[PDB]
Amino acid sequence: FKTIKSDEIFAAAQKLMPGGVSSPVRAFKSVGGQPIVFDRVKDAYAWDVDGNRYIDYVGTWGPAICGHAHPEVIEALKVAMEKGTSFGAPCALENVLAEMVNDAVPSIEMVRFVNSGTEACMAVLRIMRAYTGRDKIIKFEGCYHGHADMFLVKAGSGVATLGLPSSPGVPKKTTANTLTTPYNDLEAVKALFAENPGEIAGVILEPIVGNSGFIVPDAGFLEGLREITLEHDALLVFDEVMTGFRIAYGGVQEKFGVTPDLTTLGKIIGGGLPVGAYGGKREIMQLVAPAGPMYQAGTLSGNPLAMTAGIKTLELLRQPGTYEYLDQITKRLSDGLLAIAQETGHAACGGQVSGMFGFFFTEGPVHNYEDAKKSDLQKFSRFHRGMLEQGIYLAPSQFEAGFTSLAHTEEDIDATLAAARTVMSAL
Amino acid sequence: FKTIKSDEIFAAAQKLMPGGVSSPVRAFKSVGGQPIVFDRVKDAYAWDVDGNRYIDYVGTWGPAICGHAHPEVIEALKVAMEKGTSFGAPCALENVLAEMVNDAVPSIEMVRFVNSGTEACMAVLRIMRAYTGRDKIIKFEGCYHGHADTANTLTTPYNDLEAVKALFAENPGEIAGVILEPIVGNSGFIVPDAGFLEGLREITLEHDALLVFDEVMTGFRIAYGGVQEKFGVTPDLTTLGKIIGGGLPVGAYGGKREIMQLVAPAGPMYQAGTLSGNPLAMTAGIKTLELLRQPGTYEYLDQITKRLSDGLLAIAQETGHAACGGQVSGMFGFFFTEGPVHNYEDAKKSDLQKFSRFHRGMLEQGIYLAPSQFEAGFTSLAHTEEDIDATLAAARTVMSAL
Numbered sequence: 001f002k003t004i005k006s007d008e009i010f011a012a013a014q015k016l017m018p019g020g021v022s023s024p025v026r027a028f029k030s031v032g033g034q035p036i037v038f039d040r041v042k043d044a045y046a047w048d049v050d051g052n053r054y055i056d057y058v059g060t061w062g063p064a065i066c067g068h069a070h071p072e073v074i075e076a077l078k079v080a081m082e083k084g085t086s087f088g089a090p091c092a093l094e095n096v097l098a099e100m101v102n103d104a105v106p107s108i109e110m111v112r113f114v115n116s117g118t119e120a121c122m123a124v125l126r127i128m129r130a131y132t133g134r135d136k137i138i139k140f141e142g143c144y145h146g147h148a149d150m151f152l153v154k155a156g157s158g159v160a161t162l163g164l165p166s167s168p169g170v171p172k173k174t175t176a177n178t179l180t181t182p183y184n185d186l187e188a189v190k191a192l193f194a195e196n197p198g199e200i201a202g203v204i205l206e207p208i209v210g211n212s213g214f215i216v217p218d219a220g221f222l223e224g225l226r227e228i229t230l231e232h233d234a235l236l237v238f239d240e241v242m243t244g245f246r247i248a249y250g251g252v253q254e255k256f257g258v259t260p261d262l263t264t265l266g267k268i269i270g271g272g273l274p275v276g277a278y279g280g281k282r283e284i285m286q287l288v289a290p291a292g293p294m295y296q297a298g299t300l301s302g303n304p305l306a307m308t309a310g311i312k313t314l315e316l317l318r319q320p321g322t323y324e325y326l327d328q329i330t331k332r333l334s335d336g337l338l339a340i341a342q343e344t345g346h347a348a349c350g351g352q353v354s355g356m357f358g359f360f361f362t363e364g365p366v367h368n369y370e371d372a373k374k375s376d377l378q379k380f381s382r383f384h385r386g387m388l389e390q391g392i393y394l395a396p397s398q399f400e401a402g403f404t405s406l407a408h409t410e411e412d413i414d415a416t417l418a419a420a421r422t423v424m425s426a427l
Numbered sequence: 428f429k430t431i432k433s434d435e436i437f438a439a440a441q442k443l444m445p446g447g448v449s450s451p452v453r454a455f456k457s458v459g460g461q462p463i464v465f466d467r468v469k470d471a472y473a474w475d476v477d478g479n480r481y482i483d484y485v486g487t488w489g490p491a492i493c494g495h496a497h498p499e500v501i502e503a504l505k506v507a508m509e510k511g512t513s514f515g516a517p518c519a520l521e522n523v524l525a526e527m528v529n530d531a532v533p534s535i536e537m538v539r540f541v542n543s544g545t546e547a548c549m550a551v552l553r554i555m556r557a558y559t560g561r562d563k564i565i566k567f568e569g570c571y572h573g574h575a576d577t578a579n580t581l582t583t584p585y586n587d588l589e590a591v592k593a594l595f596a597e598n599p600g601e602i603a604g605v606i607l608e609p610i611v612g613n614s615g616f617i618v619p620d621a622g623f624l625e626g627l628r629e630i631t632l633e634h635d636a637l638l639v640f641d642e643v644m645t646g647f648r649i650a651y652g653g654v655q656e657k658f659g660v661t662p663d664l665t666t667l668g669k670i671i672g673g674g675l676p677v678g679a680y681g682g683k684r685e686i687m688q689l690v691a692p693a694g695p696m697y698q699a700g701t702l703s704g705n706p707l708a709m710t711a712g713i714k715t716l717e718l719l720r721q722p723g724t725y726e727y728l729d730q731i732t733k734r735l736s737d738g739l740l741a742i743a744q745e746t747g748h749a750a751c752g753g754q755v756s757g758m759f760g761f762f763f764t765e766g767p768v769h770n771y772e773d774a775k776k777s778d779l780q781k782f783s784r785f786h787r788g789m790l791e792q793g794i795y796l797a798p799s800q801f802e803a804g805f806t807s808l809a810h811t812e813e814d815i816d817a818t819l820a821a822a823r824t825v826m827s828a829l
């Protein structure tokens with residue numbers, strides 16, 4: 001297994017960029033160091049600058065639900081750019097994508113496009129406070145909503161993987177407004193309200209956690225949060241940047257039947273280009289400028305290229321059988337992995353919902369971020385390297401969920417299992 | 428002058444999106460409230476959904492310095508997407524654009540790409556505080572750095588050293604640093620007075636504080652190395668955007684090596700992005716920077732923009748309208764006031780009522796200008812000698828009827 005070309009690129013990259021990457025998540029530090037540099041991607045595969053081919057389960061971290069370089073998305077982009085990539089003025093495509101989002105997500109009646117998930121979470125945070133007139137926010141330990149100052153408190157994703165503390169450079173007076181609590185703990189949430197009458201703007205969370213391993217909500221947890229937020233006139237916000245259009249066309253809120261007041265979107269809406277969005281109850285969105293007093297702008301927001309990519313991606317997802325195929329092949333992958341740990345003598349546990357899954361090296365079960373930190377990170381590191389050599393590409397972290405796409409085949413799944421068998425037997 | 432199709436589209440939009448737009452200024456509230464919807468852009472022109480053609484002086488707010496839909500940029504983008512648009516892992520192209528940026532911007536020794544000028548400003552503010560361990564920051568009235576906000580932000584008037592000195596004297600050992608637009612564009616075109624930039628450089632060094640340049644709009648337009656290269660003052664950290672994205676969503680922040688080392692994964696300060704550094708944005712940036720390094724680029728922009736700026740100010744003379752303006756390279760200004768304009772306060776003395784009418788008039792003559800008095804104008808390498816003459820001819824007709 002040669003990675004000569006990647007080490008060269010990476011070695012030179014560390015002199016030009018912090019840690020040689022554009023995002024900490026691409027580090028590989030907690031998994032043995034030395035990342036592989038990609039040359040190209042297509043359907044369910046990725047290729048090294050060294051020629052190695054892999055069955056990809058990261059999917060550029062979520063966007064590639066239709067598979068990499070889907071031919072209908074690329075053809076639509078070629079035709080579109082002939083007309084220019086950015087106008088800086090209104091265009092017909094913004095109206096089209098807007099309607100599609102409103103019909104798809106239950107809580108969204110009015111939307112606003114931005115360029116990333118971080119931009120979407122920052123804006124919804126500022127709108128939560130502006131609408132209720134309150135300053136405090138409640139977030140769960142292990143969840144991640146981009147890097148806006150108030151959110152850098154007990155965050156998951158890279159921070160967890162890298163074992164970092166609440167980031168420095170952010171004034172203690174701003175983080176004082178951020179209240180935390182364990183995931184799946186309704187009682188802890190009631191206490192917070194009890195001790196802070198008239199101060200909580202609302203609650204923000206990942207309807208189904210993906211940034212501290214794959215975690216599903218306990219029975220009654222989402223319904224419970226919806227109940228107590230109504231009691232105290234607080235807002236319930238769903239960050240579906242990762243789950244939107246993946247767990248279901250209308251996201252987790254559609255699948256589990258609970259409707260929030262505001263929800264965020266990203267990744268898949270961009271079909272591969274930089275895009276984000278936030279929308280919800282009309283009476284709330286009315287406060288956004290130029291309709292209202294809360295200012296929020298963006299130069300490239302709503303450019304024709306990105307709109308074109310989002311439109312085409314949602315049309316493909318609307319075809320019948322889409323979400324059923326995703327559940328079918330992902331369940332077979334999840335169950336298989338669990339059966340194999342069992343036979344080789346390894347404690348493990350996991351699960352899947354649609355095309356999202358998780359696999360921990362601990363017997364658990366896993367109900368929160370604390371249970372997850374009990375996984376054998378030493379074993380996971382060896383497991384990850386072994387898979388990489390057998391030609392399977394997994395997220396370089398025990399705290400990241402994995403993904404499948406419409407381009408993954410029954411054969412690709414079987415090949416992944418055969419590879420898991422070989423690796424685990426030698427652990 | 429028919430705008431039937433635009434009015435219909437914009438009307439349906441207000442029921443789907445806040446105020447019917449993705450960004451405030453696009454709604455035309457400062458000049459009537461009736462925006463025109465674009466269908467396509469090319470070279471120096473733009474086209475209506477009604478078939479109308481305009482000579483564009485907005486250039487999608489900065490990025491289109493090489494002209495709309497440059498054939499060599501579009502061609503490179505077509506070849507690159509056959510390999511995929513996003514990887515989620517390192518790619519060789521990140522190294523390329525990164526080196527080009529380090530070699531072009533004086534103060535940049537190490538860089539991190541992001542997805543907008545806004546993400547860059549968020550990151551740079553947090554990095555300023557983490558490096559010094561202080562919480563106070565100074566910005567100027569009339570300058571824009573995204574919405575990164577909070578009594579930890581002190582403001583002062585642009586072009587006023589004294590007010591800055593005072594702020595340090597009242598908050599000893601609490602100021603992390605100062606951030607500003609080396610040349611203002613987000614509240615009209617405003618150049619810095621003699622010794623103002625030098626003043627700030629020296630005053631920040633005395634207190635072990637940082638100096639930060641937000642060159643999202645000036646970088647690569649005023650000069651290849653931005654304002655810091657043309658005027659000779661070197662900051663500690665700088666933000667970039669617009670042009671390095673060549674038309675796609677891109678941003679960046681860099682500076683001295685030792686300061687950038689705090690950015691994860693190399694350091695404790697956290698900042699990330701799923702789409703950061705994708706091969707499509709990098710390809711657009713590389714090719715845009717290559718076209719700018721061609722001979723006579725910035726000379727040409729100054730040549731045609733001086734004719735335009737001077738002509739305009741002269742036309743206002745003949746027709747009897749108080750006015751003042753100016754230009755540096757391919758960036759110009761023009762206010763309906765005798766001026767001069769040294770800060771945000773002087774700029775507000777403009778006769779908005781007159782600007783609104785002047786705007787519609789030019790729009791009808793086939794000239795598209797920023798829908799606001801507090802926005803700078805732009806020219807590109809695609810604007811020709813004739814395009815400039817036709818614009819001056821149109822301004823004569825409009826100002827002779829105000």
Ligand SMILES: Cc1ncc(COP(=O)(O)O)c(C)c1O
Nearest residue numbers: 116117118145146241242700701
């Ligand atoms: C749930 C969730 N919200 C927000 C973000 C940040 O979005 P982006 O990386 O596009 O800024 C991520 C990565 C995420 O997984």
Ligand SMILES: Cc1ncc(COP(=O)(O)O)c(C)c1O
Nearest residue numbers: 298299543544545571572643644
């Ligand atoms: C000086 C300046 N700073 C920041 C920004 C924000 O960049 P963007 O709109 O890409 O977020 C702009 C547009 C700008 O001109």
Ligand SMILES: NC[C@@H](N)CCC(=O)O
Nearest residue numbers: 023025061157699700701
């Ligand atoms: N770790 C969470 C992923 N969705 C991506 C993070 C990133 O690269 O910014």
